[PDB]
RNA sequence: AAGACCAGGC
DNA sequence: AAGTACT
DNA sequence: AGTACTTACGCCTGGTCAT
């Protein structure tokens, strides 16, 4: 398989699995309180889309790099621009990656590792738990009602007007086409 | 647990169970196909050339010795003296 | 080994945790209902019921089905039954247990009969050591027959402090057979301890009850010592023997298990009959006899169950007593491939480190090798050579893990090699092989010698290695192994090698030398007396190979 | 320390324990007429401070248990007063190397 | 028996000697940690001999026109003769072979001086002899600083144990200890002169080889010591084909099963 | 042929760790089973083909192992556990030391 | 909800591959075997970040044969959905019993009884689709969907999802 | 001192026979049999009761009741046994085993 | 093919 | 048969 | 003081009888 930095001492008995819900309780790999391999403690990692398509676009990049360091010896036009960047450093069986590529690049909401930085810096100001800092970053949001029903783990960590600011500035900031 | 290359304690030279061993299982691989570090002067026998690749001390090797409370030393065929 | 890949990781054994078996769990694990005794025949039909042995176990007639886990016979272990008891059993091994607990704790309530509050007690419960504290424990309240319900605290012996309540009085108990028997104490009253009552008792006594006293809670709960569902090992544990068809062949096991089955049955059809209260009680008995000598039966409670015939039945246990059996004599010591032995004699042409293999053997014995571009050339030619002529081989295998057997074949004399693939090829000179002669009570009993294939029917030893394998010729016989992995070797060569044990630790002093002949004359071809002419010197210069040729 | 002759009461040695930290001990005439590590054999033995003990744990990586131990009873243990836990060195000859260093704990 | 009850133990990296729990048994294989392989009956001069000998033979006193080197062994023979900053190292060594002498005595009461001991010294120097082809007749050309200082310098280098603290290298001399005193016995400024003639040359040699030759009878952490001791008892008790006491393998039996009513019970009181 | 106690004893008096297991397994035992990495039992209803691995009652399909081991000390096994005795298999230590 | 979990990998190396770029093989290996996974509990294996300070550290050499074992430690971007996430796709499927959303690199399905009322399923349309007063539903057309349940299998992942709650449907 | 005593006496036993055994090996046994408290008997009623895994002492003299009383009082086997690993078809620590190797890429590379 | 015995070899 | 250890 | 409990060399070759 693939481990995963924790070793649960299972003791015969396997049995509890709780429910995984938007009550915010993941399945155990996925505490807000993770292991690093450096041995350290690390916040759990959320991702909203179109800053996923960043981070995926980044090392795929930076592998193509690599790729030759030892060789030696607009919406639709990004469309092309990966499936190019995929058919040179992916499997070419990742048919997953590549649905992934496309879902994550035409359902993004931000362009600019820029823009999505101060979506980061903004939401990161709440205590909110990274879940939510995800679905709040990757949702069309106009009231507070359309984000704490789409996401009822807010409900009560958060006042509407607040949350109704963040959801403002959020349209505001949520780059062209 | 491990242990720095320096605070280091062991015996500085290999004991015969290791290099018993190293020149074993180094053959196996070598009779495996595996790459031959060493120019064979001609030599055809796997056990043969790891003596040698054991005497230009160009095994690719490490010893890890573990201490009766589990924590190890980590030494290289390059540095173990080879008396015997 | 097996066979056929697994896209299951590997890894070594580092622990064992010994548990007890929750009747709970044996029910999960087993894929048997095992609700019928007989064996097959569906109305003579041959195949199998879904009673015993099959009702998805493993299998037998060569035929893949195994619960569709396939793969047949080889490489499909059994796979675990279960089979209701009637009625709770005890462990025939646990007995001695089941005892001295009750005599821990007593019944109604359940529940130990000395707390902190008894100060001989604390001492007893410091002791980090299952096999202490309850053999200090048990010592301490065997006496005690009297669930004590108020004790004078760490104060005033005059303030008396309440725990637990009930007070019914503790009765000693003793071993009657298979059961446990104890008196309540003007005279005595005596009862039989049902199983189902016993089981109760442990049930409920408590967490911290179960780990003070020697135990663990997800392993080993007492109780568990009382059988209540029963594991039925599959046929390759207790396999059958077919004299081809129309016969039979079952094992003795099959049958403990039969009768067991019977017993239960026949008990269970009377509580739901004509049930005569305490006529019954006759009946469980007897399967609390059989389910107890299943497992042992050179029990001091005399019979012995012999099966029809007087024969003795071998219980479980016995095919692990010591020696001759599974632990001691297959697991620390096994019968083994590429060995040899014959008789032993003298050559004093032989280098001490050598061996003479007769060629016979050395046509017998094979050993892999493994085709590379250092060797494929010569190996081919083994190959070619076949497996009659001596300097040959018999068995080329393919990365396809397929045997090729070099004598048959239509391609015999075909075959291009290919890197990668083994040439089971014969032993030649200088392969190094681990000779040695029983009894073996040194590290020189077995030493590593170097062969040398020649005629006639005898390994030839040299002399001087004789008094460490401490052997003579007067019809003596020795064997030899033949390693298997270029790293095996190397390791004979490396640190088993004759040349290397002539100096013994066992004593700081060589310990091979110069004996007979040798010795003898090595003494007169010495003496002032002693003089040899040119003619002679010469030959006897050109004898010792590394004369520097200088008369 | 008391010294008795012949014997004492088992009713009265039963209350050695009762006073801690304070403690006592029981010694017969008769086991002390002769000095037990005088004797060619006993070697001399070597009581170690809390603190010299936590070292030699530490020096050969070893735990309480895997140590060589002595008897809460034994002759010497006595003659020393060791205490349940308290670590001896032991101190012998050797006709391998003149001197060979030993450890016991108590038990 | 003797063998399930050893299997588990053997010598590990340390230099201890445990078994499967970690329990250690002998905090230094055999006290000494030498593999009973490199090992020879050896004397240790320095114990038999009337203290008159012992003087004639180590004793050097460089203030005494009898008891100094005479100038017709050593180079600077006669420009020594007297100087006062040698005779304290002079003096040193023989306040120590002296030391040697006692502790010996107290070691091995019987005065039996042949013992097992790794790097057979004896020999070692006899080939130096011969290689060297050292004639008796010329003188050497060694400073006795030369000798002392080197000597010292050579136990430093003979490690069996080598821990970087205290408690450890203090073991270390410990289970050198005996070996030494053979060694302060063999390289005694008057012996190493007026016996065997030896060099600069010789002697550095003589030198380095002790050391390696030291370094290679140590035990290889891995030995299965266990076992092997198991065996070499057993082994010679099989061997045994049989004034009037239990005596042999009976006797045997009775020891290893700790049996409280010996057949014979003696006792011997001086 | 036989390779008893006695041999084995010498073969770990020489210290030949490789050529002992070689005796004891690929000249002679050796058998690869499956385990379950929660109840360390051989149950695991392995068909290597479709892969499918399975081990109901602790229930698994993902954290499962092979072993390679003495056929007799499988059977060793599961002769305890008929016996009602549980033997487990963990491919990894816990108790540290 | 996309994540990036540290993870390890063990794999065993012949010695044929013994070479002087190792490591290369190694890493290009460890793609193989990962870049495309599934497991119930790391859901997608999508793709593995910083590919170049990847740890391998040293790798023991087995006892019988040379292959020797490193356990490769790495990074990636994974993603397991959830009974009761939210997220919208691009629907891929219509039939009589529903239409399947993209979500991602999986497939969440919806019930045409798990959907509203007042949205009926016109067979006779083409391409197949759903409509309603106002809201016509189709091939392209783009949803947001909520995860009622999820089911692991083989090398992926389903769930059920709907849109029968509020702020939910069409976009 | 009792050591001192049991060493001496079978050193006469072994001596007795004039055959010679290095003390080291005498001196073992002699200290197997006396470190754990006082005389810990070489046999079915001592040593194989010490705090030695299951598995071990099981290949000896009791076997079966030993595994019993094992699965009671759920034991734990290190597996660093001898005997264990012989039973487990698994390569002993012991000589040959006593350590791992590796092959380091590292210098896997100056290496050509 | 398994198990009990008996004779025997070193 | 004996020897030990346990009742 | 009486009774009970587990053990007993290593390996190897023959021929014989029967539920
Ligand atoms: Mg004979
Ligand atoms: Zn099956
Ligand atoms: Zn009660
Ligand atoms: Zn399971």
Same mark, same amino acid.
């Given at each position: 398989?693939?481990?995963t930095f924790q070793?649960?001492?299972?003791?015969?008995?396997?049995?509890?699995?709780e429910?995984n819900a938007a009550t915010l309780q993941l399945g155990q790999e996925f505490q807000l309180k993770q292991i690093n391999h450096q041995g350290e403690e690390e916040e759990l990692i959320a991702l909203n889309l179109s800053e996923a398509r960043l981070v995926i676009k980044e090392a795929l990049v930076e592998?193509?790099?690599?790729?030759?360091?030892?060789?030696?010896?607009?919406?639709?036009?990004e469309?092309?621009?990966?499936?190019?960047?995929?058919?040179?450093? &992916?499997?070419?069986?990742?048919?997953?990656?590549?649905?992934t590529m496309?879902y994550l690049t035409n359902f993004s909401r931000f362009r600019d590792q820029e823009t999505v930085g101060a979506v980061i810096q903004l939401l990161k100001s709440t205590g909110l738990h990274p879940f939510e800092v995800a679905q709040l970053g990757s949702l069309a949001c106009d009231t507070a009602d359309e984000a704490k029903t789409l996401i009822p783990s807010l409900n009560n960590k958060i006042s509407d007007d607040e949350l109704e600011r963040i959801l403002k500035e959020l349209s505001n900031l949520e780059t062209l086409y | 647990?491990?242990?720095?290359?320096?605070?280091?304690?062991?015996?500085?030279?290999?004991?015969?169970?290791?290099?018993?061993?190293?020149?074993?299982?180094?053959?196996?691989? +070598?009779?495996?196909?595996?790459?031959?570090?060493?120019?064979?002067?001609?030599?055809?026998?796997?056990?043969? +050339? !790891?003596?040698?690749?054991?005497?230009?001390?160009?095994?690719?090797?490490? +010893?890890?010795?573990?201490?009766?409370?589990?924590?190890?030393?980590? @030494?290289?065929?390059?540095?173990?003296?080879?008396?015997? | 080994?097996?066979?056929?890949?697994?896209?299951?990781?590997?890894?070594?054994?580092?622990?064992?945790?010994?548990?007890?078996?929750?009747?709970?769990?044996?029910?999960?694990?087993?894929?048997?209902?095992?609700?019928?005794?007989?064996?097959?025949?569906?109305?003579?039909?041959?195949?199998?019921?879904?009673?015993?042995?099959?009702?998805?176990?493993?299998?037998?007639?060569?035929?893949?089905?195994?619960?569709?886990?396939?793969?047949?016979?080889?490489?499909?272990?059994?796979?675990?039954?279960?089979?209701?008891?009637?009625?709770?059993?005890?462990?025939?091994?646990?007995?001695?247990?089941?005892?001295?607990?009750?005599?821990?704790?007593?019944?109604?309530?359940?529940?130990?009969?000395?707390?902190?509050?008894?100060?001989?007690?604390?001492?007893?419960?410091?002791?980090?050591?299952?096999?202490?504290?309850? !053999?200090?424990?048990?010592?301490?309240?065997?006496?005690?027959?009297?669930?004590?319900?108020?004790?004078?605290?760490?104060?005033?012996?005059?303030?008396?402090?309440?725990?637990?309540?009930?007070?019914?009085?503790?009765?000693?108990?003793?071993?009657?057979?298979?059961?446990?028997?104890?008196? @309540?104490?003007?005279?005595?009253?005596?009862?039989?301890?049902?199983?189902?009552? +016993?089981?109760?008792?442990?049930?409920?006594?408590?967490?911290?009850?179960?780990?003070?006293?020697?135990?663990?809670?997800?392993?080993?709960?007492?109780? @568990?010592?009382?059988?209540?569902?029963?594991?039925?090992?599959?046929?390759?544990?207790?396999?059958?023997?077919?004299?081809?068809?129309?016969?039979?062949?079952?094992?003795?096991?099959?049958?403990?298990?039969?009768?067991?089955?019977?017993?239960?049955?026949?008990?269970?059809?009377?509580?739901?009959?004509?049930?005569?209260?305490?006529?019954?009680?006759?009946?469980?008995?007897?399967?609390?006899?059989?389910?107890?000598?299943?497992?042992?039966?050179?029990?001091?409670?005399?019979?012995?169950?012999?099966?029809?015939?007087?024969?003795?039945?071998?219980?479980?246990?016995?095919?692990?007593?010591?020696?001759?059996?599974?632990?001691?004599?297959?697991?620390?010591?096994?019968?083994?491939?590429?060995?040899?032995?014959?008789?032993?004699?003298?050559?004093?042409?032989?280098?001490?480190?050598?061996?003479?293999?007769?060629?016979?053997?050395?046509?017998?014995?094979?050993?892999?090798?493994?085709?590379?571009?250092?060797?494929?050339?010569?190996?081919?030619?083994?190959?070619?050579?076949?497996?009659?002529?001596?300097?040959?081989?018999?068995?080329?295998?393919?990365?396809?893990?397929?045997?090729?057997?070099?004598?048959?074949?239509?391609?015999?004399?075909?075959?291009?090699?290919?890197?990668?693939?083994?040439?089971?090829?014969?032993?030649?000179?200088?392969?190094?092989?681990?000779?040695?002669?029983?009894?073996?009570?040194?590290?020189?009993?077995?030493?590593?010698?170097?062969?040398?294939?020649?005629?006639?029917?005898?390994?030839?030893?040299?002399?001087?290695?004789?008094?460490?394998?401490?052997?003579?010729?007067?019809?003596?016989?020795?064997?030899?192994?033949?390693?298997?992995?270029?790293?095996?070797?190397?390791?004979?060569?490396?640190?088993?090698?004759?040349?290397?044990?002539?100096?013994?630790?066992?004593?700081?002093?060589?310990?091979?030398?110069?004996?007979?002949?040798?010795?003898?004359?090595?003494?007169?071809?010495?003496?002032?007396?002693?003089?040899?002419?040119?003619?002679?010197?010469?030959?006897?210069?050109?004898?010792?190979?590394?004369?520097?040729?200088?008369? | 320390?008391?010294?008795?002759?012949?014997?004492?009461?088992?009713?009265?040695?039963?209350?050695?324990?009762?006073?801690?930290?304070?403690?006592?001990?029981?010694?017969?005439?008769?086991?002390?007429?002769?000095?037990?590590?005088?004797?060619?054999?006993?070697?001399?033995?070597?009581?170690?401070?809390?603190?010299?003990?936590?070292?030699?744990?530490?020096?050969?990586?070893?735990?309480?248990?895997?140590?060589?131990?002595?008897?809460?009873?034994?002759?010497?243990?006595?003659?020393?007063?060791?205490?349940?836990?308290?670590?001896?060195?032991?101190?012998?000859?050797?006709?391998?190397?003149?001197?060979?260093?030993?450890?016991?704990?108590?038990? | =028996?003797?063998?399930?009850?050893?299997?588990?133990?053997?010598?590990?990296?340390?230099?201890?000697?445990?078994?499967?729990?970690?329990?250690?048994?002998?905090?230094?294989?055999?006290?000494?940690?030498?593999?009973?392989?490199?090992?020879?009956?050896?004397?240790?001069? &320095?114990?038999?001999?009337?203290?008159?000998?012992?003087?004639?033979?180590?004793?050097?006193?460089?203030?005494?026109?009898?008891?100094?080197?005479?100038?017709?062994?050593?180079?600077?023979?006669?420009?020594?003769?007297?100087?006062?900053?040698?005779?304290?190292?002079?003096?040193?060594?023989?306040?120590?072979?002296?030391?040697?002498?006692?502790?010996? =005595?107290?070691?091995?009461?019987?005065?039996?001086?042949? @013992?097992?001991?790794?790097?057979?010294?004896?020999?070692?120097?006899?080939?130096?002899?011969? &290689?060297?082809?050292?004639?008796?007749?010329?003188?050497?050309?060694?400073?006795?600083?030369?000798?002392?200082?080197?000597?010292?310098?050579?136990?430093?280098?003979?490690?069996?144990?080598?821990?970087?603290?205290?408690?450890?290298?203090?073991?270390?001399?410990?289970?050198?200890?005996?070996?030494?005193?053979?060694?302060?016995?063999?390289?005694?400024?008057?012996?190493?002169?007026?016996?065997?003639?030896?060099?600069?040359?010789?002697?550095?040699?003589?030198?380095?080889?002790?050391?390696?030759?030291?370094?290679?009878?140590?035990?290889?952490?891995?030995?299965?010591?266990?076992?092997?001791?198991?065996?070499?008892?057993?082994?010679?008790?099989?061997?045994?084909?049989?004034?009037?006491?239990?005596?042999?393998?009976?006797?045997?039996?009775?020891?290893?099963?700790?049996?409280?009513?010996?057949?014979?019970?003696?006792? &011997?009181?001086? | 042929?036989?390779?008893?106690?006695?041999?084995?004893?010498?073969?770990?008096?020489?210290?030949?760790?490789?050529?002992?297991?070689?005796?004891?397994?690929?000249?002679?035992?050796?058998?690869?089973?499956?385990?379950?990495?929660?109840?360390?039992?051989?149950?695991?209803?392995?068909?290597?083909?479709?892969?499918?691995?399975?081990?109901?009652?602790?229930?698994?399909?993902?954290?499962?192992?092979?072993?390679?081991?003495?056929?007799?000390?499988?059977?060793?096994?599961?002769?305890?556990?008929?016996?009602?005795?549980?033997?487990?298999?963990?491919?990894?230590?816990?108790?540290?030391? | 909800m996309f994540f990036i979990k540290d993870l390890?990998?063990?794999?065993?190396?012949?010695?044929?591959?013994?070479?002087?770029?190792?490591?290369?093989?190694?890493?290009?290996?460890?793609?193989?075997?990962?870049?495309?996974?599934?497991?119930?509990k790391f859901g997608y294996i999508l793709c593995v970040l910083d590919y170049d300070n990847?740890?391998?550290? =040293?790798?023991?050499?087995?006892?019988?044969?040379?292959?020797?074992?490193?356990?490769?430690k790495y990074r990636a971007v994974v993603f397991k959905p959830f009974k009761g996430e939210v997220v919208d796709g691009?629907?891929?499927?219509?039939?009589?019993?529903?239409?399947?959303?993209?979500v991602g690199p999986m497939?969440?399905?919806?019930?045409?009884?798990?959907?509203?009322?007042?949205?009926?399923?016109?067979?006779?349309?083409?391409?197949?689709?759903?409509?309603?007063?106002?809201?016509?539903?189709?091939?392209?057309?783009?949803?947001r969907v909520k995860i009622?349940?999820?089911?692991?299998?083989?090398?992926?992942?389903?769930?059920?999802?709907?849109?029968?709650?509020?702020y939910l449907?069409?976009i | 001192?009792?050591?001192?005593?049991?060493?001496?006496?079978?050193?006469?036993?072994?001596?007795?026979?004039?055959?010679?055994?290095?003390?080291?090996?005498?001196?073992?046994?002699?200290?197997?049999?006396?470190?754990?408290?006082?005389?810990?008997?070489?046999?079915?009623?001592?040593?194989?009761?010490?705090?030695?895994?299951?598995?071990?002492?099981?290949?000896?003299?009791?076997?079966?009741?030993?595994?019993?009383?094992?699965?009671?009082?759920?034991?734990?086997?290190?597996?660093?046994?001898?005997?264990?690993?012989?039973?487990?078809?698994?390569?002993?620590?012991?000589?040959?085993?006593?350590?791992?190797?590796?092959?380091?890429?590292?210098?896997?590379?100056?290496?050509?």
């Open positions: 398989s693939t481990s070793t649960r001492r299972r003791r015969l008995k396997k049995v509890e699995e429910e592998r193509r790099r690599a790729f030759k360091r030892s060789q030696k010896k607009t919406r639709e036009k469309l092309e621009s990966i499936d190019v960047l995929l058919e040179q450093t &992916t499997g070419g069986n990742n048919k997953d990656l590549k649905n496309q | 647990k491990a242990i720095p290359k320096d605070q280091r304690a062991t015996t500085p030279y290999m004991t015969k169970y290791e290099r018993a061993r190293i020149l074993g299982t180094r053959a196996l691989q +070598i009779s495996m196909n595996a790459p031959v570090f060493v120019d064979l002067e001609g030599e055809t026998d796997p056990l043969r +050339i !790891a003596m040698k690749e054991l005497a230009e001390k160009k095994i690719p090797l490490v +010893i890890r010795r573990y201490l009766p409370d589990g924590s190890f030393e980590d @030494w290289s065929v390059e540095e173990l003296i080879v008396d015997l | 080994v097996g066979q056929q890949y697994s896209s299951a990781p590997l890894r070594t054994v580092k622990e064992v945790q010994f548990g007890l078996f929750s009747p709970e769990e044996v029910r999960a694990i087993s894929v048997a209902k095992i609700r019928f005794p007989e064996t097959m025949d569906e109305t003579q039909t041959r195949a199998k019921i879904g009673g015993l042995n099959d009702p998805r176990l493993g299998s037998i007639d060569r035929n893949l089905k195994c619960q569709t886990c396939q793969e047949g016979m080889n490489e499909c272990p059994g796979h675990f039954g279960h089979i209701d008891l009637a009625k709770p059993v005890f462990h025939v091994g646990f007995i001695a247990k089941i005892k001295k607990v009750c005599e821990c704790v007593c019944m109604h309530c359940g529940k130990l009969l000395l707390d902190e509050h008894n100060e001989l007690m604390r001492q007893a419960l410091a002791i980090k050591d299952s096999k202490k504290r309850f !053999a200090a424990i048990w010592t301490l309240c065997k006496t005690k027959m009297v669930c004590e319900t108020d004790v004078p605290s760490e104060d005033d012996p005059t303030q008396l402090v309440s725990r637990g309540g009930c007070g019914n009085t503790q009765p000693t108990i003793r071993k009657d057979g298979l059961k446990l028997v104890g008196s @309540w104490k003007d005279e005595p009253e005596l009862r039989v301890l049902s199983t189902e009552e +016993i089981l109760n008792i442990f049930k409920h006594i408590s967490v911290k009850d179960f780990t003070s006293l020697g135990f663990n809670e997800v392993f080993s709960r007492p109780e @568990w010592m009382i059988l209540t569902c029963l594991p039925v090992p599959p046929p390759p544990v207790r396999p059958s023997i077919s004299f081809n068809e129309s016969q039979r062949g079952e094992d003795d096991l099959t049958f403990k298990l039969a009768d067991i089955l019977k017993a239960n049955i026949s008990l269970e059809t009377l509580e739901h009959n004509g049930a005569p209260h305490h006529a019954i009680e006759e009946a469980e008995s007897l399967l609390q006899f059989h389910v107890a000598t299943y497992m042992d039966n050179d029990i001091a409670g005399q019979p012995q169950a012999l099966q029809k015939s007087g024969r003795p039945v071998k219980s479980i246990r016995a095919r692990l007593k010591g020696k001759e059996g599974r632990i001691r004599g297959n697991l620390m010591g096994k019968r083994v491939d590429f060995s040899a032995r014959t008789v032993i004699s003298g050559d004093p042409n032989l280098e001490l480190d050598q061996v003479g293999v007769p060629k016979s053997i050395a046509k017998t014995l094979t050993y892999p090798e493994v085709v590379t571009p250092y060797n494929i050339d010569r190996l081919t030619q083994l190959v070619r050579n076949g497996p009659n002529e001596h300097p040959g081989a018999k068995y080329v295998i393919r990365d396809s893990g397929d045997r090729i057997d070099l004598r048959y074949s239509k391609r015999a004399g075909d075959i291009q090699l290919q890197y990668g693939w083994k040439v089971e090829r014969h032993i030649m000179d200088n392969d190094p092989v681990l000779f040695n002669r029983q009894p073996s009570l040194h590290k020189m009993s077995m030493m590593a010698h170097r062969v040398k294939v020649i005629p006639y029917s005898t390994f030839r030893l040299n002399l001087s290695v004789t008094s460490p394998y401490n052997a003579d010729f007067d019809g003596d016989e020795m064997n030899l192994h033949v390693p298997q992995s270029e790293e095996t070797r190397a390791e004979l060569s490396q640190l088993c090698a004759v040349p290397l044990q002539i100096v013994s630790p066992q004593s700081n002093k060589p310990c091979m030398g110069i004996v007979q002949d040798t010795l003898c004359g090595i003494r007169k071809l010495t003496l002032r007396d002693t003089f040899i002419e040119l003619d002679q010197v010469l030959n006897m210069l050109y004898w010792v190979p590394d004369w520097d040729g200088v008369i | 320390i008391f010294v008795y002759q012949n014997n004492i009461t088992p009713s009265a040695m039963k209350l050695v324990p009762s006073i801690p930290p304070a403690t006592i001990e029981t010694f017969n005439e008769a086991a002390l007429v002769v000095n037990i590590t005088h004797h060619e054999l006993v070697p001399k033995h070597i009581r170690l401070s809390s603190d010299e003990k936590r070292e030699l744990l530490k020096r050969y990586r070893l735990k309480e248990s895997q140590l060589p131990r002595i008897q809460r009873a034994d002759p010497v243990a006595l003659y020393l007063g060791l205490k349940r836990g308290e670590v001896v060195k032991i101190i012998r000859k050797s006709e391998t190397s003149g001197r060979y260093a030993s450890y016991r704990i108590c038990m | =028996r003797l063998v399930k009850a050893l299997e588990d133990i053997m010598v590990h990296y340390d230099n201890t000697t445990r078994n499967s729990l970690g329990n250690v048994i002998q905090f230094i294989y055999g006290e000494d940690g030498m593999d009973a392989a490199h090992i020879e009956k050896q004397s240790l001069d &320095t114990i038999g001999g009337s203290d008159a000998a012992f003087e004639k033979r180590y004793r050097v006193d460089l203030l005494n026109t009898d008891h100094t080197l005479d100038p017709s062994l050593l180079e600077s023979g006669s420009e020594i003769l007297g100087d006062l900053k040698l005779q304290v190292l002079l003096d040193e060594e023989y306040k120590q072979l002296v030391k040697d002498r006692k502790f010996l =005595r107290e070691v091995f009461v019987d005065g039996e001086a042949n @013992w097992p001991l790794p790097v057979n010294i004896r020999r070692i120097i006899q080939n130096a002899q011969q &290689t060297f082809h050292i004639d008796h007749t010329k003188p050497s050309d060694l400073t006795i600083k030369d000798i002392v200082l080197g000597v010292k310098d050579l136990q430093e280098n003979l490690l069996v144990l080598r821990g970087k603290n205290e408690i450890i290298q203090n073991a270390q001399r410990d289970a050198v200890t005996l070996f030494c005193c053979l060694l302060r016995s063999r390289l005694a400024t008057r012996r190493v002169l007026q016996e065997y003639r030896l060099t600069k040359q010789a002697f550095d040699w003589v030198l380095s080889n002790i050391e390696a030759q030291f370094l290679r009878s140590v035990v290889h952490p891995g030995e299965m010591v266990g076992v092997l001791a198991a065996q070499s008892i057993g082994e010679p008790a099989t061997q045994m084909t049989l004034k009037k006491v239990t005596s042999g393998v009976p006797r045997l039996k009775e020891i290893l099963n700790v049996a409280k009513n010996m057949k014979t019970p003696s006792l &011997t009181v001086y | 042929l036989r390779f008893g106690e006695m041999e084995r004893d010498c073969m770990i008096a020489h210290g030949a760790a490789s050529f002992l297991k070689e005796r004891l397994m690929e000249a002679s035992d050796a058998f690869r089973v499956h385990i379950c990495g929660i109840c360390g039992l051989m149950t695991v209803i392995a068909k290597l083909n479709h892969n499918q691995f399975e081990c109901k009652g602790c229930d698994n399909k993902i954290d499962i192992y092979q072993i390679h081991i003495p056929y007799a000390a499988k059977l060793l096994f599961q002769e305890l556990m008929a016996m009602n005795i549980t033997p487990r298999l963990y491919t990894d230590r816990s108790r540290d030391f | 390890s990998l063990n794999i065993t190396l012949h010695p044929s591959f013994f070479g002087p770029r190792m490591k290369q093989y190694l890493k290009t290996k460890l793609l193989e075997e990962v870049e495309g996974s599934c497991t119930g990847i740890d391998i550290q =040293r790798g023991r050499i087995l006892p019988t044969d040379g292959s020797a074992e490193f356990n490769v691009t629907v891929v499927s219509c039939s009589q019993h529903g239409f399947e959303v993209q497939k969440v399905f919806v019930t045409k009884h798990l959907m509203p009322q007042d949205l009926t399923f016109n067979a006779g349309s083409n391409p197949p689709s759903y409509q309603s007063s106002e809201d016509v539903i189709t091939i392209k057309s783009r949803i009622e349940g999820c089911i692991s299998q083989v090398s992926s992942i389903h769930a059920i999802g709907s849109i029968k709650e509020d449907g069409a | 001192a009792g050591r001192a005593a049991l060493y001496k006496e079978v050193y006469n036993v072994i001596a007795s026979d004039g055959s010679y055994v290095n003390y080291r090996h005498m001196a073992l046994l002699v200290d197997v049999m006396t470190t754990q408290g006082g005389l810990t008997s070489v046999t079915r009623h001592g040593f194989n009761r010490s705090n030695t895994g299951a598995l071990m002492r099981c290949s000896f003299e009791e076997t079966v009741e030993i595994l019993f009383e094992a699965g009671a009082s759920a034991e734990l086997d290190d597996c660093r046994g001898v005997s264990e690993n012989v039973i487990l078809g698994q390569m002993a620590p012991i000589g040959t085993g006593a350590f791992d190797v590796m092959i380091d890429e590292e210098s896997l590379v100056k290496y050509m």
